[PDB]
Amino acid sequence: RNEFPEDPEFEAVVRQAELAIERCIFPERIYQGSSGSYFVKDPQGRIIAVFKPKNEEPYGHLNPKWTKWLQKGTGNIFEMLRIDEGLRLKIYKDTEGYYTIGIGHLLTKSPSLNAAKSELDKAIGRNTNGVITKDEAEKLFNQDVDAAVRGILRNAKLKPVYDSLDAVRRAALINMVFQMGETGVAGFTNSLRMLQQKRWDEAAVNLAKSRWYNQTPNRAKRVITTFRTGTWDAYKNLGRDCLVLNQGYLSEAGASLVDQKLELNIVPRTKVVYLASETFNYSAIDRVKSRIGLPPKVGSFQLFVEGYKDADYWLRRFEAEPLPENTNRQLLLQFERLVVLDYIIRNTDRGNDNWLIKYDDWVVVKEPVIKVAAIDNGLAFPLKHPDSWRAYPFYWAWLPQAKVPFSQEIKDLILPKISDPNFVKDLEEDLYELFKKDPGFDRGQFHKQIAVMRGQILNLTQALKDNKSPLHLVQMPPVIVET
Numbered sequence: 001r002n003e004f005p006e007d008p009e010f011e012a013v014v015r016q017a018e019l020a021i022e023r024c025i026f027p028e029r030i031y032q033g034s035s036g037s038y039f040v041k042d043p044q045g046r047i048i049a050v051f052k053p054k055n056e057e058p059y060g061h062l063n064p065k066w067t068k069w070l071q072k073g074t075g076n077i078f079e080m081l082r083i084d085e086g087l088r089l090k091i092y093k094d095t096e097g098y099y100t101i102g103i104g105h106l107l108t109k110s111p112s113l114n115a116a117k118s119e120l121d122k123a124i125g126r127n128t129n130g131v132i133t134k135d136e137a138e139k140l141f142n143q144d145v146d147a148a149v150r151g152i153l154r155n156a157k158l159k160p161v162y163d164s165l166d167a168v169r170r171a172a173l174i175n176m177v178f179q180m181g182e183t184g185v186a187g188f189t190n191s192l193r194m195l196q197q198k199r200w201d202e203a204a205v206n207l208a209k210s211r212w213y214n215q216t217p218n219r220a221k222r223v224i225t226t227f228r229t230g231t232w233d234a235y236k237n238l239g240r241d242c243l244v245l246n247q248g249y250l251s252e253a254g255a256s257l258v259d260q261k262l263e264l265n266i267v268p269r270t271k272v273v274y275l276a277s278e279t280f281n282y283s284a285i286d287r288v289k290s291r292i293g294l295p296p297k298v299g300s301f302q303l304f305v306e307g308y309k310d311a312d313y314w315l316r317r318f319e320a321e322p323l324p325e326n327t328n329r330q331l332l333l334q335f336e337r338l339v340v341l342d343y344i345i346r347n348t349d350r351g352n353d354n355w356l357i358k359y360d361d362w363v364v365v366k367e368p369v370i371k372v373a374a375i376d377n378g379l380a381f382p383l384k385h386p387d388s389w390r391a392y393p394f395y396w397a398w399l400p401q402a403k404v405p406f407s408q409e410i411k412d413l414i415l416p417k418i419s420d421p422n423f424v425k426d427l428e429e430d431l432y433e434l435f436k437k438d439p440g441f442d443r444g445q446f447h448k449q450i451a452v453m454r455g456q457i458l459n460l461t462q463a464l465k466d467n468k469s470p471l472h473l474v475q476m477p478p479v480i481v482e483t
């Protein structure tokens with residue numbers, strides 16, 4: 001059900017896409033894309049669009065890169081604990097103050113370092129002098145995992161639960177018996193009951209309250225969600241966490257909404273579109289029921305533009321051979337629109353590969369020589385400002401173009417809109433109607449998104465009134481406007 005009566009040009013392109021699929025001309029996967037980025041083509045083989053299925057997103061469930069991972073099932077217990085325990089080749093103290101080594105291997109609860117060092121030689125088979133190798137730490141690791149699996153299966157309170165768990169939760173319980181040992185996890189009998197009855201939101205709470213967790217919450221909270229969600233999501237991207245989890249396609253489409261309303265027209269038109277293609281990455285199940293073929297996947301569909309190179313490609317050239325004044329002033333105006341987009345949607349990823357330039361008495365405006373396309377917008381609309389601005393900056397702030405004060409032209413375009421509270425209200429309702437359609441939508445998460453966006457507008461409004469540069473704009477302390 002793909003229709004956009006508001007945008008018959010967009011719909012027409014989409015219809016060529018579907019028809020081209022019917023004719024067995026499949027969107028082909030961009031190499032040097034996310035595994036989940038595709039080139040949509042029409043029946044004549046030309047590239048009309050870029051398509052990014054939600055479920056093939058980097059955090060995506062059907063993402064090819066992480067498919068290898070989901071097979072292991074419990075066998076992910078190794079990587080899971082490597083991440084939680086880290087690696088050390090020399091004796092250290094654990095969270096409780098106990099002598100430890102390699103990957104989470106507890107030597108003794110004794111205060112004596114030679115108890116521990118002694119205890120270490122017993123294990124390794126030589127005089128270690130408190131220092132072991134990578135292979136030695138790995139050998140302790142397997143034995144300690146076996147000991148956990150044994151601890152679970154030799155135990156009456158634990159075993160029943162474990163057998164009722166899916167491959168992933170089992171891994172979580174092993175995780176626990178690795179840190180606390182057999183006997184310790186069996187004092188949780190409540191949560192084991194819930195886990196046992198399959199109520200996830202039940203148990204995820206009680207483990208939230210324990211002597212454990214309290215000591216190492218950062219780790220504890222990582223399993224609890226592995227218990228609650230039956231997935232590896234806490235061990236995938238720990239953490240981006242500036243952003244909502246698997247809504248990249250909506251960022252993509254949303255970026256295009258904003259462009260539309262502010263009338264910037266740098267974002268090639270992008271909407272939420274459903275497509276089915278044999279070239280996509282589907283569950284084996286789905287592949288089989290098709291024999292009634294593959295189901296359509298929901299994704300961002302962004303129109304394709306020709307004649308453009310990397311911002312990087314061109315700016316490199318304009319520096320060696322500077323543009324004539326008049327053309328170069330057309331660049332700056334395309335550039336201001338980009339800064340406004342990115343500041344408003346709070347893009348966390350814009351590099352010089354993430355935007356594109358094209359360089360070529362009357363009723364009509366002479367065509368512009370230079371023009372800016374803003375692509376790859378699925379990393380915006382954060383839940384909050386990034387903790388270290390250096391990790392997720394605005395790259396264009398260090399460009400010289402960022403030094404030039406905002407043009408009257410932009411103030412004229414943008415101030416009347418973002419100064420009108422009814423514009424910002426309408427803009428937020430439109431984003432809501434887009435975002436609420438996601439099955440994993442959360443009203444509370446949304447409000448935070450809007451808060452950031454409202455704080456960015458607050459800053460941009462005053463930056464524009466003062467004729468500040470883009471650079472001075474980003475130096476303004478980030479704010480949120482919270483209801």
Ligand SMILES: Nc1ncnc2c1ncn2[C@@H]1O[C@H](COP(=O)(O)OP(=O)(O)OP(=O)(O)O)[C@@H](O)[C@H]1O
Binds near residue numbers: 035305
């Ligand atoms: N709308 C578009 N029109 C024309 N070309 C595009 C468009 N979008 C992307 N491209 C080209 O395809 C490449 C796709 O890059 P894009 O970053 O959008 O996908 P991605 O690589 O999956 O994202 P990421 O780089 O974050 O993994 C771009 O570098 C650009 O060269």
Ligand SMILES: Nc1ncnc2c1ncn2[C@@H]1O[C@H](COP(=O)(O)OP(=O)(O)OP(=O)(O)O)[C@@H](O)[C@H]1O
Binds near residue numbers: 389394398476
């Ligand atoms: N590339 C950028 N992207 C985003 N924000 C930036 C960028 N460059 C500067 N800023 C913002 O401008 C402000 C300028 O601070 P700057 O780093 O120049 O001095 P500073 O006081 O050392 O910053 P801090 O001590 O907070 O790291 C920072 O608070 C930051 O918010």
